[PDB]
């Protein structure tokens, strides 16, 4: 199936409290593999997945050096943005950056991303043609011109279409056992009477990987989108995910409802009915 690799960077200023907090994490699909925490003792890029631990010191020394360069860039960015929007040097602010690439089921380049946000709001992003930019406001346009003059977009497409896809593949290979696995969800339902005339029917999807999944409830085969309590897909903590969906059913009508499950790990969609 499809795959992706992306780096997430969060920078938070700490006025009068010293250096800005900086955190970086890398993911291949839904598995995190590296991290860097400006407040940590090592001051180095660190492994968060078993399959990346085999990389030698050359890899860790290199990534530690580049991630520190990122840290410094965002430390300069915080001050610049503070200036662009004429803000008090006393308040705390946040800058986030995300970039990466997607490859199809054929492991071939599908698309590249490079987005930036200031205080949780879109600031600037690289368009899909990897040649132009989307500037949120006037401050962003100033950054856009700067990046255009420095031919930043060009350097980004080379990384996104080359290096990014190349290393993603390498990671997928080195981590075949983890990254290339598909754990079809384990499913089951629970029934709990809220009153003498209504009951809760909950549909569970457990231990599945990857995270992408579709879980719905239907009544007489019709969608119940608005009468369904659907929770956000969540991490189990062991690399797998979970999710459930529930509907309040009039006692005696359990048979009219069906749970539907779709996942890459299931050759054919599942349909469950309490009976």
């Amino acid at each position: 199936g499809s795959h992706s690799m992306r780096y997430f960077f969060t920078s938070v200023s700490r006025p009068g409290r010293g250096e800005p907090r900086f955190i970086a994490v890398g993911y291949v699909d839904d598995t995190q593999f590296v991290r860097f925490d400006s407040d940590a003792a090592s001051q180095r890029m660190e492994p968060r997945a078993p399959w990346i631990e085999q990389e030698g010191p050359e890899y860790w020394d290199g990534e530690t050096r580049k991630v520190k360069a990122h840290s410094q860039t965002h430390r300069v960015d915080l001050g610049t943005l503070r200036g662009y929007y004429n803000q008090s040097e006393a308040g705390s602010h946040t800058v986030q950056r995300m970039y990466g690439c997607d490859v199809g089921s054929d492991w071939r380049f599908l698309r590249g991303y490079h987005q930036y946000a200031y205080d949780g709001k879109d600031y600037i992003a690289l368009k899909e043609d990897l040649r132009s930019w989307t500037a949120a406001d006037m401050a962003a346009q100033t950054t856009k011109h700067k990046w255009e003059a420095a031919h930043v977009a060009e350097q980004l497409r080379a990384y996104l279409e080359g290096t990014c896809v190349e290393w993603l593949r390498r990671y997928l290979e080195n981590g075949k056992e983890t990254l290339q696995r598909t754990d079809a969800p384990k499913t089951h339902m629970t029934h709990h009477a809220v009153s003498d005339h209504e009951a809760t029917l909950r549909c569970w999807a457990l231990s599945f990987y990857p995270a992408e999944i579709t879980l719905t409830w239907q009544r007489d085969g019709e969608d119940q989108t608005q009468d369904t309590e659907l929770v956000e897909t969540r991490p189990a903590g062991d690399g797998t995910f979970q999710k459930w969906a529930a509907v309040v059913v009039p006692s005696g009508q359990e048979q009219r409802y069906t749970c539907h499950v779709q996942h890459e790990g299931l050759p054919k969609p599942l349909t469950l009915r309490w009976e």
């Binding site: 290199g62 600037i124 990384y159 290096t163």
Partner: peptide
């Protein structure tokens, strides 16, 4: 791996 260059805003 991370990208090489990182220009400021």
């Amino acid at each position: 791996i991370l990208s090489a260059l990182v220009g400021i805003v």
